[PDB]
Design a binder for this molecule. Sequence first.
Ligand SMILES: Cc1cn([C@H]2C[C@H](n3cc(CNC(=O)Nc4cccc(S(N)(=O)=O)c4)nn3)[C@@H](CO)O2)c(=O)[nH]c1=O
Ligand SMILES: [Zn+2]
Length: 258
Amino acid sequence: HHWGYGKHNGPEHWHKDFPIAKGERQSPVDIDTHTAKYDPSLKPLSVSYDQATSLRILNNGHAFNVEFDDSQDKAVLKGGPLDGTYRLIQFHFHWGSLDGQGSEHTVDKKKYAAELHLVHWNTKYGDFGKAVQQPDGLAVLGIFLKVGSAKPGLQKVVDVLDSIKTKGKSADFTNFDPRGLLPESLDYWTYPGSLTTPPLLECVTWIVLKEPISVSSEQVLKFRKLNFNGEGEPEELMVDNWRPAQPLKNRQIKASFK
Ligand SMILES: Cc1cn([C@H]2C[C@H](n3cc(CNC(=O)Nc4cccc(S(N)(=O)=O)c4)nn3)[C@@H](CO)O2)c(=O)[nH]c1=O
Ligand SMILES: [Zn+2]
């Protein structure tokens, strides 16, 4: 009886196995755009993905991860609210059963159809597993998806999903360029938070871009054909794999822009 997104194992249950679910810096949150303060001291984000080396795509039973070689400074995030250098390890998405829901963060209570998380770890801690034990261990770049025009740079991901339909399946996934998933503007909100899935560790500097990317209805429909289940198990569509907004508590969301 493992955690998931069902009635008997979803977000409202997670606190029994993971009591930090009710902690002081949980994610995601609602971004109240009028309460966020412009912080003129925040630096432009530096996204350096030219040498990124994707390796594999994995259905892990809660999402799919596109994994990168993080054994060298090849795809890094720095600047913005960050001190030092954070290396890209994986990206994944959260999405809905319908276009009206699916994001984890919300903006003035608006839910987007999906949310992309580009996960990076602070190189001063040596590896991802040590980084997640630190309050500044991770930097997650969050990007909202809305349904409209297709995102051409997403299609290579969409077209491999048939090969990883079920939990535990992986496929080689080399030469994928994550620059093709970024919006034009790097304007962002930032706040201290957590992983949005168990173990819900309070180790993330969240950087949420204001500008969504557009994907087509056909692209998100292919996300919704994935399965939570393993092969030869009852089919349960991988949809609504998002945690709802958590209390802000004693936190301030800062804006990079006026
Ligand atoms: C000890 C050790 C552990 N590890 C990893 C595996 C282990 N783990 C992974 C999951 C699944 N949960 C997520 O992946 N959550 C998540 C991870 C990153 C971002 C986000 S999100 N949605 O907020 O963007 C969520 N459950 N447990 C995690 C902490 O225990 O550290 C390692 O790589 N090397 C090690 O030496
Ligand atoms: Zn995520």
